[PDB]
Design a protein around this ligand. Structure first.
Ligand code: N49
Length: 127
């Protein structure tokens, strides 16, 4: 089972803008999560070939990872903060759906999600 193409990070047909919230998501939120000790398995798409997980993309049909999110933020792919927040939430949810409660990868996702939620509670009001 080969890997799918990664999620899109550039598309001239999709509208986009910069907002103060999206700039916070890159400079504060992504930056903090990216340097966490447990970030590395989330820094690129799940490579189901390398991991010998041929079922992964039979079960997870909306893949997401922080490397994709980072590129989307650096490329100003998004129209609003909610789109980007949804990508982080999809990344976490996928991990919790695919893996067993208590698996190491789930504990690593949960630590990142705890930091994410702190930072999202501090999301600035739109200017
Ligand atoms: C960089 C993406 S990669 O695919 O190229 N490499 C890579 C390497 C290891 C991975 O898993 C572990 C990592 C650390 C521990 Cl302690 C335990 C498992 C994963 C991985 C990530 N996710 C989000 C999963 O849901 C997942 C589910 C099952 C197996 C592996 C993974 C990906």
């Amino acid at each position: 089972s080969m890997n799918p193409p990664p999620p899109e990070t550039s598309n001239p047909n999709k509208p986009k803008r910069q907002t103060n919230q999206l700039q916070y998501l890159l400079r504060v939120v992504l930056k903090t999560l990216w340097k966490h000790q447990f970030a590395w398995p989330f820094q690129q798409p799940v490579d189901a070939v390398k991991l010998n997980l041929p079922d992964y993309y039979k079960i997870i049909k909306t893949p997401m990872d922080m490397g994709t999110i980072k590129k989307r933020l650096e490329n100003n792919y998004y129209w609003n903060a909610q789109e980007c927040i949804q990508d982080f939430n999809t990344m976490f949810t996928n991990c919790y759906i695919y893996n067993k409660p208590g698996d190491d990868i789930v504990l690593m996702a949960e630590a990142l999600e705890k930091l994410f939620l702190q930072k999202i509670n501090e999301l600035p009001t739109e200017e």
